[PDB]
Amino acid sequence: CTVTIEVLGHELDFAQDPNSKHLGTTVWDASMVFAKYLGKNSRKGRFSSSKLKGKRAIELGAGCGVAGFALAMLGCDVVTTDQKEVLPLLKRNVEWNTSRIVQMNPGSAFGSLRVAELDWGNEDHITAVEPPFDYVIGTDVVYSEQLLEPLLRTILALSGPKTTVMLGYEIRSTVVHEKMLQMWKDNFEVKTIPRSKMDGEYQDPSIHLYIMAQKS
Ligand SMILES: Nc1ncnc2c1ncn2[C@@H]1O[C@H](CSCC[C@H](N)C(=O)O)[C@@H](O)[C@H]1O
């Protein structure tokens, strides 16, 4: 079971494990909406190559790894993380596609992409990936009320004053939605990226992209 997606004109292959009960063994639609958003906003602004020079990003709950891979393709250095059980598939997908795009574009310089274990809230895991990061990203990592606080605490622990948080999100329970929105509003300055910045094909009304700056 392997999904082939085009990102920045490159055909990538992401292995999946449907034999697994683990949520992260499947590619979720928010990661693809995030990757396609980057492809559309990488010519000018904060995701252009010159503006990403020297920037470091960390992906939380990367699963199969689509979102962090796209960001690394833009020239950002990226540490992609998940729990131990997901890491072998993540490591497989990173290394298989890294060798593909570099053989496809030998002269181009992509950002680095290294896999690390990070259980949300584990201070030892957080210290070990070497924060602070310029970007903290996550796609479809909000779904269960009990995971809101550990994710929040992790994002803050990896952040500094100038850190930007990018969140790909799919609305499910309205109760959880309202708790999540209030939480982000209590901790960040939140903006909701509009439909026009997302690709015409990779856009379902239920998928939202948030971009959040640290609070004053
Ligand atoms: N407490 C926790 N610590 C670290 N990762 C967690 C976690 N709880 C859930 N996750 C991870 O969050 C991911 C949710 S599925 C999202 C996968 C990927 N970002 C995508 O968009 O396709 C899973 O990989 C799961 O392992």
JSON list of C-alpha atoms and ligand atoms in Angstrom, two decimals, residues 23-31 59-65 67 81-83 86 118-120 138-141 143 147 150, ligand 1:
[
{"chain": "A", "resi": 23, "resn": "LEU", "atom": "CA", "xyz": [-3.47, 6.46, 12.99]},
{"chain": "A", "resi": 24, "resn": "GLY", "atom": "CA", "xyz": [-0.10, 7.71, 11.72]},
{"chain": "A", "resi": 25, "resn": "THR", "atom": "CA", "xyz": [0.36, 4.79, 9.31]},
{"chain": "A", "resi": 26, "resn": "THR", "atom": "CA", "xyz": [-2.07, 6.43, 6.84]},
{"chain": "A", "resi": 27, "resn": "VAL", "atom": "CA", "xyz": [-1.69, 9.70, 4.95]},
{"chain": "A", "resi": 28, "resn": "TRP", "atom": "CA", "xyz": [-4.36, 12.17, 6.12]},
{"chain": "A", "resi": 29, "resn": "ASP", "atom": "CA", "xyz": [-5.89, 14.82, 3.87]},
{"chain": "A", "resi": 30, "resn": "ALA", "atom": "CA", "xyz": [-4.63, 17.77, 5.94]},
{"chain": "A", "resi": 31, "resn": "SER", "atom": "CA", "xyz": [-0.99, 16.91, 5.24]},
{"chain": "A", "resi": 59, "resn": "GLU", "atom": "CA", "xyz": [6.99, 18.57, 12.58]},
{"chain": "A", "resi": 60, "resn": "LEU", "atom": "CA", "xyz": [4.88, 17.02, 15.32]},
{"chain": "A", "resi": 61, "resn": "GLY", "atom": "CA", "xyz": [2.89, 13.82, 14.69]},
{"chain": "A", "resi": 62, "resn": "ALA", "atom": "CA", "xyz": [4.37, 13.49, 11.21]},
{"chain": "A", "resi": 63, "resn": "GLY", "atom": "CA", "xyz": [2.94, 10.02, 10.55]},
{"chain": "A", "resi": 64, "resn": "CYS", "atom": "CA", "xyz": [3.97, 9.00, 7.03]},
{"chain": "A", "resi": 65, "resn": "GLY", "atom": "CA", "xyz": [5.77, 12.36, 6.67]},
{"chain": "A", "resi": 67, "resn": "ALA", "atom": "CA", "xyz": [3.98, 17.78, 5.46]},
{"chain": "A", "resi": 81, "resn": "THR", "atom": "CA", "xyz": [8.90, 13.38, 14.70]},
{"chain": "A", "resi": 82, "resn": "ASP", "atom": "CA", "xyz": [6.32, 10.89, 15.94]},
{"chain": "A", "resi": 83, "resn": "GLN", "atom": "CA", "xyz": [6.05, 8.08, 18.47]},
{"chain": "A", "resi": 86, "resn": "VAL", "atom": "CA", "xyz": [5.44, 5.23, 13.63]},
{"chain": "A", "resi": 118, "resn": "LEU", "atom": "CA", "xyz": [9.05, 12.87, 20.25]},
{"chain": "A", "resi": 119, "resn": "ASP", "atom": "CA", "xyz": [6.24, 11.84, 22.60]},
{"chain": "A", "resi": 120, "resn": "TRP", "atom": "CA", "xyz": [4.26, 15.01, 23.26]},
{"chain": "A", "resi": 138, "resn": "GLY", "atom": "CA", "xyz": [1.50, 19.69, 12.49]},
{"chain": "A", "resi": 139, "resn": "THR", "atom": "CA", "xyz": [-1.23, 18.33, 10.25]},
{"chain": "A", "resi": 140, "resn": "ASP", "atom": "CA", "xyz": [-4.34, 16.52, 11.54]},
{"chain": "A", "resi": 141, "resn": "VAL", "atom": "CA", "xyz": [-2.83, 16.31, 15.02]},
{"chain": "A", "resi": 143, "resn": "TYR", "atom": "CA", "xyz": [-8.77, 15.16, 17.09]},
{"chain": "A", "resi": 147, "resn": "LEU", "atom": "CA", "xyz": [-4.34, 15.34, 23.30]},
{"chain": "A", "resi": 150, "resn": "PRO", "atom": "CA", "xyz": [0.08, 17.74, 25.55]},
{"chain": "B", "resi": 1, "resn": "LIG", "atom": "N1", "xyz": [1.09, 11.91, 22.22]},
{"chain": "B", "resi": 1, "resn": "LIG", "atom": "C1", "xyz": [1.62, 11.89, 20.99]},
{"chain": "B", "resi": 1, "resn": "LIG", "atom": "N2", "xyz": [2.97, 12.10, 20.81]},
{"chain": "B", "resi": 1, "resn": "LIG", "atom": "C2", "xyz": [3.53, 12.07, 19.57]},
{"chain": "B", "resi": 1, "resn": "LIG", "atom": "N3", "xyz": [2.74, 11.83, 18.47]},
{"chain": "B", "resi": 1, "resn": "LIG", "atom": "C3", "xyz": [1.42, 11.62, 18.63]},
{"chain": "B", "resi": 1, "resn": "LIG", "atom": "C4", "xyz": [0.82, 11.65, 19.88]},
{"chain": "B", "resi": 1, "resn": "LIG", "atom": "N4", "xyz": [-0.49, 11.40, 19.72]},
{"chain": "B", "resi": 1, "resn": "LIG", "atom": "C5", "xyz": [-0.73, 11.23, 18.40]},
{"chain": "B", "resi": 1, "resn": "LIG", "atom": "N5", "xyz": [0.44, 11.38, 17.72]},
{"chain": "B", "resi": 1, "resn": "LIG", "atom": "C6", "xyz": [0.68, 11.26, 16.28]},
{"chain": "B", "resi": 1, "resn": "LIG", "atom": "O1", "xyz": [-0.12, 12.15, 15.53]},
{"chain": "B", "resi": 1, "resn": "LIG", "atom": "C7", "xyz": [-0.38, 11.58, 14.26]},
{"chain": "B", "resi": 1, "resn": "LIG", "atom": "C8", "xyz": [-1.85, 11.79, 13.96]},
{"chain": "B", "resi": 1, "resn": "LIG", "atom": "S1", "xyz": [-2.34, 11.24, 12.30]},
{"chain": "B", "resi": 1, "resn": "LIG", "atom": "C9", "xyz": [-1.51, 12.61, 11.44]},
{"chain": "B", "resi": 1, "resn": "LIG", "atom": "C10", "xyz": [-0.36, 12.10, 10.56]},
{"chain": "B", "resi": 1, "resn": "LIG", "atom": "C11", "xyz": [0.23, 13.12, 9.57]},
{"chain": "B", "resi": 1, "resn": "LIG", "atom": "N6", "xyz": [0.61, 14.36, 10.25]},
{"chain": "B", "resi": 1, "resn": "LIG", "atom": "C12", "xyz": [-0.76, 13.40, 8.46]},
{"chain": "B", "resi": 1, "resn": "LIG", "atom": "O2", "xyz": [-1.31, 14.50, 8.40]},
{"chain": "B", "resi": 1, "resn": "LIG", "atom": "O3", "xyz": [-1.05, 12.52, 7.64]},
{"chain": "B", "resi": 1, "resn": "LIG", "atom": "C13", "xyz": [-0.02, 10.10, 14.34]},
{"chain": "B", "resi": 1, "resn": "LIG", "atom": "O4", "xyz": [1.15, 9.80, 13.59]},
{"chain": "B", "resi": 1, "resn": "LIG", "atom": "C14", "xyz": [0.25, 9.87, 15.81]},
{"chain": "B", "resi": 1, "resn": "LIG", "atom": "O5", "xyz": [1.28, 8.94, 16.03]}
]
